[PDB]
């Protein structure tokens, strides 16, 4: 089960090192490209978004052709994923505990924004990126190691932005003042208000297209290193406000660095599983990855506009088991255990909760106790088979994570 190094992926070879933390299970998902699978719910959202840009977005010059990139390799450099987007070298979004690193220099993209700089650099004014993205996180019905994002970028020239106004040729895109909560230092408020208006009006119309003139949305001010001002859009769903996308006015240093210093732009990044789970009332993110026809056939529509009225699957009983152990001497991350659960338990596991931790005074070691909910999306799980999965996770935690079984 070692080496250890190398890792081979899509023909290329990645020497392992101190950053390397890809699990075999996660790599078996690379290439699957659910966003490209005809009649998959993620493919369906992608197509409806594409049609909206092609038919229903208007510009004064008028409206850009959005070139669509849904087949980019997820293997990116840390420069693509982080530095091109002005993300600081000490930013927590870079933590080994949160990202799948092939090694020091390469990784599975954590967001589709990892392609913004390159596509700008190629001179494109308007583009969509659709792709599988990869993040190390907890286990519950809303988190999965792979999910899918749709990115959009839209640049404006000065005369395009101000095209509707009389003395517009004296209005400008850029100035030299201060950054506020409302604008970057090199942007005029004249420009920012028009870009922000275009961004939100375009997203509101896309949501009305996807959902119907019924839904309740709200804009929440937030922060990203690569846009300013920035927002999340939240949809109220089952009584709770849920974020589905981040967006904002692109940081001018990013746009200038790619070679488009005569442009101002907006960008957004939407979570396809998050929206699909809301649009269709899909209760667990693991359903996107199952091949059960009770789920999948419901999204075979005659055309991408035939409304699908998702009928929820039966829920099957769960088996609950706890697992406690002594942490190794200062070398452990919660997300390592979560990776190992994914590896051994796979899609049998509905969630894992760290329920207890304490330090033992005589020994100085830390104990963790995790509660593991076993529940299959397609069938009832036998006590017998869960017992065997659980015992294997216990032994595996001892061999690989260096834990000491406390149970
Ligand atoms: N990349 C961000 C979303 C985003 C895209 C573009 C602009 C602003 C925000 C994320 O994954 O959360």
Author numbering: 9 to 415
Give the article text:
Among the recently reported pathogenic variants are point mutations in FARS2 gene, encoding the human mitochondrial PheRS. Patient symptoms range from spastic paraplegia to fatal infantile Alpers encephalopathy.
Here, we report four crystal structures of HsmtPheRS mutants, and extensive MD simulations for wild‐type and nine mutants to reveal the structural changes on dynamic trajectories of HsmtPheRS.
